[PDB]
Design a protein around this ligand. Sequence first.
Ligand SMILES: Cc1cn([C@H]2C[C@H](O)[C@@H](COP(=O)(O)OP(=O)(O)O)O2)c(=O)[nH]c1=O
Ligand SMILES: Cc1cn([C@H]2C[C@H](O)[C@@H](COP(=O)(O)O)O2)c(=O)[nH]c1=O
Ligand SMILES: [Mg+2]
Lengths: 203, 195
Amino acid sequence: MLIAIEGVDGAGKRTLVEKLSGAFRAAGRSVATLAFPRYGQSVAADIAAEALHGEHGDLASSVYAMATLFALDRAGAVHTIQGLCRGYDVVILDRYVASNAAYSAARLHENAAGKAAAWVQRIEFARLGLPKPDWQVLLAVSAELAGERSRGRARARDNYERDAELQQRTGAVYAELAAQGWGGRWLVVGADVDPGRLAATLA
Amino acid sequence: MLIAIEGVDGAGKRTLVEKLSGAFRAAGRSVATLAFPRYGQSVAADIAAEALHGEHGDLASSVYAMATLFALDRAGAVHTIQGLCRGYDVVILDRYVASNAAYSAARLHENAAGKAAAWVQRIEFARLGLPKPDWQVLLAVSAELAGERDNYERDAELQQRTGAVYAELAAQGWGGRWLVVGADVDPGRLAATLA
Ligand SMILES: Cc1cn([C@H]2C[C@H](O)[C@@H](COP(=O)(O)OP(=O)(O)O)O2)c(=O)[nH]c1=O
Ligand SMILES: Cc1cn([C@H]2C[C@H](O)[C@@H](COP(=O)(O)O)O2)c(=O)[nH]c1=O
Ligand SMILES: [Mg+2]
């Protein structure tokens, strides 16, 4: 059971993942969680983070270069994810493939029907062989509240987080992805969602 | 001993790799060779080539992104390089870390003493762990002779400036000692000089 948690920056994903893990375990299911990008476990991830903070020359200026590094990070995580799914009943991922599609489209002012979304789909699911998630849960939230959360919980904000319009468009692209079942079945929830009920719903 | 053969497209690196290897073997030394980018064996390498052919949107428009891909390709070969270095007296690499410094600087109109070349050293050698070559052999060729024999290959201006950064990397001893040679260099004398 592979579950992916998606959403904009400051949406509260970490928290949702926490509550959901407990609920699942409460219902006796073994849970494992993994977050992307894998800071500290991937050079591709680390360079991506440093790039979002202005480092590495013109790296961050390329939408596809950034998407590639995140995709390369997940690719190096294929055996890790398969290993988790084998050792636990529920594997929960804080951010996954859909993140790349939502942000890349948003940075290019494209929607779910744009080239970037389709490109991410082919690259990660078809070529890099990333395991399709059984569930993609979009934690939808107020753009203002999310923006403020990042501002408060800030370590300094990167170039994506300081881009209020990028965040709004990313929220919108996410909604389109969820509505059309991009990459599988989605579940849209709010911050005030009941863990136990959500868990019972997903599993 | 780890040896890297550097040079622009059309310099004749493969031929030199072949001759130098035969020379070392004749001198009673085992030799293994490896070529970069590892097209067909690396995803980073393949995406880079594809990007150089107009694929993957705006990826190729970024100098550092392209540079990062070639470096990640080399990173994936560290274990292979370390295995060769343990098994053979001489390991010859057709294109290595200096290629990234040369092409990146050339794309940015920088010189061997600039930011990009310094960046490549900080990334590949220390962060990624690529062994620093004992010798970097530059098969120097003028733009005219090279021109006589993707986005990069098609750019003569880029090829010319790349040759220029190579000439400077060699003079400044970027990443270690260098040797400049021509496609007519005598294998035996070269092997004796590198021994
Ligand atoms: C995982 C991932 C993140 N991103 C974006 C979303 C975030 O702005 C940023 C970093 O991811 P994030 O999980 O927000 O990291 P941090 O812990 O540093 O806040 O990059 C992508 O564009 N694609 C991806 O595949
Ligand atoms: C290995 C490597 C190649 N390149 C380049 C030069 C070539 O134009 C292209 C592919 O190399 P190739 O022609 O030897 O197969 O990528 C870099 O810019 N940096 C590197 O580190
Ligand atoms: Mg974030």
